[PDB]
Amino acid sequence: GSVRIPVSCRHSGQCLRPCRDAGMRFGRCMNGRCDCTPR
Numbered sequence: 001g002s003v004r005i006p007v008s009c010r011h012s013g014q015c016l017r018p019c020r021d022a023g024m025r026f027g028r029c030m031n032g033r034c035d036c037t038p039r
């Protein structure tokens with residue numbers, strides 16, 4: 001998604017919890033950082 005959070009990753013699975021804990025959804029890893037979809 002299009003919110004970029006300052007959390008590092010190499011796989012989208014690693015972004016599931018960071019995005020949830022940020023109040024957002026559908027964590028994905030893009031260019032080694034997590035992206036989230038706003039509620």
Ligand SMILES: [Cl-]
Binds near residue numbers: 020024025026027
């Ligand atoms: Cl989610």
